[PDB]
Amino acid sequence: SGFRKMAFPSGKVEGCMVQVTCGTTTLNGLWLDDVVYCPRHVICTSEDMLNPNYEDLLIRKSNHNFLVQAGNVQLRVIGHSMQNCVLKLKVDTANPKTPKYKFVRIQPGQTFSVLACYNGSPSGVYQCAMRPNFTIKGSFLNGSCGSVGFNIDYDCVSFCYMHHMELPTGVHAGTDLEGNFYGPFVDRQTAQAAGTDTTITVNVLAWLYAAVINGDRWFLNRFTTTLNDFNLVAMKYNYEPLTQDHVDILGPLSAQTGIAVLDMCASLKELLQNGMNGRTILGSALLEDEFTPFDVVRQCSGVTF
Amino acid sequence: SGFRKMAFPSGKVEGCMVQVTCGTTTLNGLWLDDVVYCPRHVICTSEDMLNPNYEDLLIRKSNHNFLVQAGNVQLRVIGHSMQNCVLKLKVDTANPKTPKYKFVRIQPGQTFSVLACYNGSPSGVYQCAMRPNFTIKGSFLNGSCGSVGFNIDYDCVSFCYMHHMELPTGVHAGTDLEGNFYGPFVDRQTAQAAGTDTTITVNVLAWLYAAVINGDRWFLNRFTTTLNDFNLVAMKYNYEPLTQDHVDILGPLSAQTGIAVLDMCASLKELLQNGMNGRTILGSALLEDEFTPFDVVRQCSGVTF
Numbered sequence: 312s313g314f315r316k317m318a319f320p321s322g323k324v325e326g327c328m329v330q331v332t333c334g335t336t337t338l339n340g341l342w343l344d345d346v347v348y349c350p351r352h353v354i355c356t357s358e359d360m361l362n363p364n365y366e367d368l369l370i371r372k373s374n375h376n377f378l379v380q381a382g383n384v385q386l387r388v389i390g391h392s393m394q395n396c397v398l399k400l401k402v403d404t405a406n407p408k409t410p411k412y413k414f415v416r417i418q419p420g421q422t423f424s425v426l427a428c429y430n431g432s433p434s435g436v437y438q439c440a441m442r443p444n445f446t447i448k449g450s451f452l453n454g455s456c457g458s459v460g461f462n463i464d465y466d467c468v469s470f471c472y473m474h475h476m477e478l479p480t481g482v483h484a485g486t487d488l489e490g491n492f493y494g495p496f497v498d499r500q501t502a503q504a505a506g507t508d509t510t511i512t513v514n515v516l517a518w519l520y521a522a523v524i525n526g527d528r529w530f531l532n533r534f535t536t537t538l539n540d541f542n543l544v545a546m547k548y549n550y551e552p553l554t555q556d557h558v559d560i561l562g563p564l565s566a567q568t569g570i571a572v573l574d575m576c577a578s579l580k581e582l583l584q585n586g587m588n589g590r591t592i593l594g595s596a597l598l599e600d601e602f603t604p605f606d607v608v609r610q611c612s613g614v615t616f
Numbered sequence: 617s618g619f620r621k622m623a624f625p626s627g628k629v630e631g632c633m634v635q636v637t638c639g640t641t642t643l644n645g646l647w648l649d650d651v652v653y654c655p656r657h658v659i660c661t662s663e664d665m666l667n668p669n670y671e672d673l674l675i676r677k678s679n680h681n682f683l684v685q686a687g688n689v690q691l692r693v694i695g696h697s698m699q700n701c702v703l704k705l706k707v708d709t710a711n712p713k714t715p716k717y718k719f720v721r722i723q724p725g726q727t728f729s730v731l732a733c734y735n736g737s738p739s740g741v742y743q744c745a746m747r748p749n750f751t752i753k754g755s756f757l758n759g760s761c762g763s764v765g766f767n768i769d770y771d772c773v774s775f776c777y778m779h780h781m782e783l784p785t786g787v788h789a790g791t792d793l794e795g796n797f798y799g800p801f802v803d804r805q806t807a808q809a810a811g812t813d814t815t816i817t818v819n820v821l822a823w824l825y826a827a828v829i830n831g832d833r834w835f836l837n838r839f840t841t842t843l844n845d846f847n848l849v850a851m852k853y854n855y856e857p858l859t860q861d862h863v864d865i866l867g868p869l870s871a872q873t874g875i876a877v878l879d880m881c882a883s884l885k886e887l888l889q890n891g892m893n894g895r896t897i898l899g900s901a902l903l904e905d906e907f908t909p910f911d912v913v914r915q916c917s918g919v920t921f
């Protein structure tokens with residue numbers, strides 16, 4: 312028993328991390344096969360960032376403008392192209408340490424592991440959620456750009472995130488591995504609102520099921536509710552609407568605990584209306600929303616990779 | 617910016633994990649050189665666990681009673697010995713994937729990364745603290761025994777923890793890699809009190825410095841305090857005494873923020889006496905005590921491995 316914010320084991324991703332330098336800018340890239348993926352703003356000067364013409368800037372770069380480094384093996388770049396907001400550097404060596412992998416785009420409310428890197432070297436690994444407003448609450452310092460987010464399913468690394476930038480609120484924005492931003496953001500230095508964040512309701516319910524699996528069940532009540540009447544209370548507390556598809560994805564946890572999803576909804580309704588009255592759930596004084604139903608099942612059933 | 621419970625990158629440890637079977641019992645071992653370390657209770661039956669005579673039980677085992685498995689490479693055991701509460705299986709193959717490493721014993725309040733494993737395969741990685749009462753608040757299911765805790769310093773894995781057992785409160789107990797339990801526990805199935813847990817004061821202060829580094833500084837006040845008068849208030853809230861050595865280890869964070877350790881103590885004093893008045897610090901409604909001063913520096917300075 313116990314319940315922790317648990318990341319995926321990171322070894323497979325560790326062996327794909329490299330250092331990419333262009334001019335004065337050094338950040339991280341992802342070395343899969345003979346390709347290094349990194350944020351396209353590696354090519355920019357401080358002055359270029361106000362409204363970069365990335366097509367023109369890249370046209371003025373040659374292969375030898377890009378220094379790629381795998382620890383010491385100084386990779387030779389033989390090609391460069393741009394896909395959306397990511398640069399792809401063809402190199403003369405295909406990464407031996409290349410794991411099996413896909414590139415996927417996660418949905419708001421889904422979770423992933425971030426391998427935070429500096430200079431192509433891992434600092435640490437942590438879990439987080441894609442927020443409904445398509446930001447993530449990461450831990451990223453200058454030089455962290457090109458750090459990636461990923462999930463592992465069987466033996467296959469699904470890359471879902473590459474880090475590009477920090478908003479003035481201290482939250483983080485980036486792209487999938489085809490270089491499309493999550494959310495409304497563009498890679499230029501302008502004020503860009505993230506828009507209203509909401510609480511990931513399906514995930515709060517998942518974590519309440521986690522609490523029950525772990526014998527912490529004080530918040531269970533005799534009341535029940537319809538999905539509609541639940542959503543009327545939840546919308547008042549800036550919670551995301553709960554959909555039938557969310558109710559379906561909570562089924563496993565419902566089945567395991569014998570608590571119907573709408574009875575857990577009735578529990579969350581009272582927590583929202585009353586607060587916790589200085590009690591805690593799985594050590595927390597706040598309702599936690601960065602565990603998916605699958606995270607709870609993974610962790611409470613000991614799924615391995 | 618941002619501040620997350622961050623684990624060490626786990627790849628180096630991943631390649632040391634193996635499956636150890638003795639009779640009906642399968643758990644994890646740590647494969648370093650030609651030695652596999654695992655909990656000695658792998659040799660026990662359900663009935664043996666009331667008061668096992670581990671010397672006599674081990675004497676009745678032969679090398680071929682122990683099935684060691686690295687994925688599929690079925691390791692042949694050529695020796696078995698006992699050191700305190702850990703079994704050492706000499707094998708015919710030394711692990712190629714063997715990283716550089718030490719075995720260390722951490723102090724109460726220090727943190728480490730746990731690589732949770734089942735059947736010699738990683739499930740996930742998370743951070744936790746050795747509690748003052750020498751338990752850890754882990755996430756461990758049946759089959760997790762032999763999962764290890766570790767830190768990385770330069771390129772050297774310091775192993776500090778091997779998982780043995782769960783207390784009826786849902787907290788966890790284990791040994792260092794010389795097989796000595798943390799805390800008063802013995803590997804037999806008897807009621808064993810953990811004793812009073814306390815809040816890791818030096819770590820709360822470290823996390824308040826983290827909050828200031830991240831622009832969350834509402835709790836800073838004009839008041840100050842002596843170390844003694846701080847400890848008079850803190851002892852009332854079941855906080856660990858703060859020592860001059862703790863004050864010294866907070867020096868870096870004091871220097872970086874220009875807030876004297878005793879001025880941060882004066883901030884914590886009011887938080888304890890008043891509570892947070894429904895405010896939060898780095899997203900939390902509770903005071904967090906599972907970051908060390910070095911964790912805050914590591915994470916706020918982007919130290920890599």
Ligand SMILES: *[C@](O)(C(=O)NC1CC1)[C@H](CCC)NC(=O)[C@@H]1[C@H]2CCC[C@H]2CN1C(=O)[C@@H](NC(=O)[C@@H](NC(=O)c1cnccn1)C1CCCCC1)C(C)(C)C
Nearest residue numbers: 337338453454455456475476477478498499500501502503
């Ligand atoms: C990353 O590339 C990296 O690690 N580089 C290695 C060090 C050499 C780097 C890491 C910063 C922590 N990312 C960036 O430099 C990005 C790029 C891409 C987009 C613009 C530039 C600057 N940048 C940022 O992350 C910045 N953030 C902003 O500029 C915000 N701007 C504003 O909020 C704003 C407000 N008023 C006027 C003008 N801008 C972002 C910009 C993008 C939309 C969201 C808001 C800093 C300031 C470096 C965090």
Ligand SMILES: *[C@](O)(C(=O)NC1CC1)[C@H](CCC)NC(=O)[C@@H]1[C@H]2CCC[C@H]2CN1C(=O)[C@@H](NC(=O)[C@@H](NC(=O)c1cnccn1)C1CCCCC1)C(C)(C)C
Nearest residue numbers: 642643758759760761780781782783803804805806807808
């Ligand atoms: C671990 O070996 C493993 O992963 N084994 C693989 C599955 C085959 C296994 C994992 C359990 C989650 N650990 C254990 O089996 C340990 C060993 C070592 C010490 C005794 C046995 C049983 N065990 C436990 O972790 C148990 N915990 C207890 O028995 C507690 N006992 C009591 O609190 C108690 C209360 N009243 C009367 C008698 N006992 C522990 C025992 C040690 C001191 C602290 C309290 C279970 C119940 C399996 C969690």
Ligand SMILES: [Cl-]
Nearest residue numbers: 596597901902
């Ligand atoms: Cl909290």
